[PDB]
Amino acid sequence: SVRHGLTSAQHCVWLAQQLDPRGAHYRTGSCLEIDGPLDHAVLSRALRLTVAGTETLCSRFLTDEEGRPYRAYCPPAPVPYTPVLLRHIDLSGHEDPEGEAQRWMDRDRATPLPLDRPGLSSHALFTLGGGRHLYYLGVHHIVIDGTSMALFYERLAEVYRALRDGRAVPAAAFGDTDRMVAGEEAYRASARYERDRAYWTGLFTDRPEPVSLRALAPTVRSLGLPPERTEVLGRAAEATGAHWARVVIAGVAAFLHRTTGARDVVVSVPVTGRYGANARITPGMVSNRLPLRLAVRPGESFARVVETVSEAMSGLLAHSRFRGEDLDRELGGAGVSGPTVNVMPYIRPVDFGGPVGLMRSISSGPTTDLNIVLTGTPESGLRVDFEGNPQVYGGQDLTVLQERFVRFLAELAADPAATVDEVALLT
Ligand SMILES: *CCCCNC(=O)[C@H](C)N
Ligand SMILES: [Cl-]
């Protein structure tokens, strides 16, 4: 009967869903590529225990008498029970197991999940042959963000190992959503809110219109880059003294500048929206997206653009609690944004007690234009996903753009002292 408050991010998704109530545009997902055999019966039991201990995966969303949303907690069965289902799809024998799995996930992601039914996720274990497996985690964005996907996978594996070893299942170690929401409420009521509002509105008084090279589920094209191609990003990071994600952001900024010739470029950057220890370990949806405005002047080196990114990010991080969707509402119209550049944080390979799982993105969220999603590291290799609004980009277009970008990025990283407007951008 308890009516739980939504996080700001959840409020955002809720409002956006209302614009297209039967749509699936806020269906997101990821998967684990697993290099050895798993026991589906045991993993199915592990999923049940994992979900049972994950409040957000046992939640539904309802409206009160004033039409305002709230979250309701619905434990699984030993008031609706959260259902738990791990599908087993044996593609061992198929001509193209990987392709069939992708097709299955794409069709699942296209399936609407009504918010008033608890358990807003979809789970499938694929057998691919050669003993390889794929675990698909499909969710409604309102219950799970990128950070929480990692929290889920780690817990799932932990429970699976215990059930496999005969060991007692370790207690879950998640945080509390109500306290996380209370933290946001405290922020909104604080003096910092006013200061943040002033900071962000001040930066965009000219209200630059978003430029491309409504929010819809993306067409996704993925490019695998081995370490031979990606190590150079690490070397650029070492040389500039900037974290490699900053090098990538600078690369996107330079790419946009070189393509369009535009002085002032905007990219959008996600931040976790998690403040404090409790928030960091609470599965849910709290992520924020903020505009990074960058001036790329004539004759600047790539290293100089990295510095420009670092300066802008310092300000973004210092005012990161202000909601991106709030900034847009105040500026009006289409708001302010560029391609979303999402360099996912490091995730250790997921240990299933022998078999190891490597995470890859399936769909990070809907977009009005483009998301650029990276998983991996310079040393281990990268998966680069270009997620394009289907009314803007065709699949082939995204493939071409993504290869062009990675080539330019690699050239920049190979010599940060080079002048950006002298670096050849090849079509
Ligand atoms: C305003 C909150 C909904 C948008 N969030 C996302 O789609 C993130 C960036 N994946
Ligand atoms: Cl997210």
* Residue in the block written with tokens 């608890």: 118
Distance CA 372, CA 358 (A): 19
Report whether residue 270 contacts ligand 1, using a CB cutoff of 6 Å. yes
Task: Tell me how the structure was determined.
Answer: X-ray
Atom 6 (ligand 1) nearest CA: 365
Residue 381 and residue 358: Cα distance in Å, rounded?
12
Rounded Cα–Cα distance for residues 338 and 340 (Å): 6
Residue span(s) of the chain under CATH 3.30.559.30 come to: 213-427
Report the C-alpha gap between 379 and 370 in whole angstroms.
26
Q: Of the ligands numbered here, which is closest to the C-alpha atom of 372? A: 1
Is residue 409 within 8 A of residue 243, CB to CB? The reply is no
Lateral strand order in the sheet of 356-363: 86-90, 121-129, 132-140, 27-34, 356-363, 350-351
| 5-38 CB burial, b ≥16 within 10 A, e <16 | bbbbbbbbbbebbeeeeeebbbbbbbbbbbbeeb
**Phi, psi (5° rounding) for residue 123?**
-130, 130
Q: What is the largest CA-CA distance in the chain?
A: 67
Q: Using DSSP, state whether 192 is helix, strand or coil.
A: helix
According to CATH, what is the number of the domain 213-427?
A: 3.30.559.30
Is the shortest distance between the CB of 416 and ligand 1 below 6 Å? no
- DSSP strand pairing (340-343 vs 370-377): parallel
Q: Is the CB of 287 under 6 A from ligand 1?
A: yes
76 neighbors 48 (Cβ within 8 angstroms):
yes
* Topology of the domain covering 6-209: Chloramphenicol Acetyltransferase (3.30.559)
325 CB within 6 A, ligand 1: yes
For helices 227-240 and 302-318, the axis angle rounded to 10 degrees is: 80
CA neighbor of 136 nearest in space, from 127, 77, 145: 127
Q: How far apart are CA 122 and CA 113, in angstroms?
A: 9
Query: Ligand 1: which residue has its CA nearest to atom 4?
Result: 13
- Token pair, residue 155, equals 């817990």
Torsion of CA 15, 19, 24, 28, to 10 degrees: -40
Could you give the angle at the alpha carbon of 364 between the alpha carbons of 145 and 341, nearest 5°? 105
Please list the residue range(s) of the chain that carry CATH number 3.30.559.10: 6-209
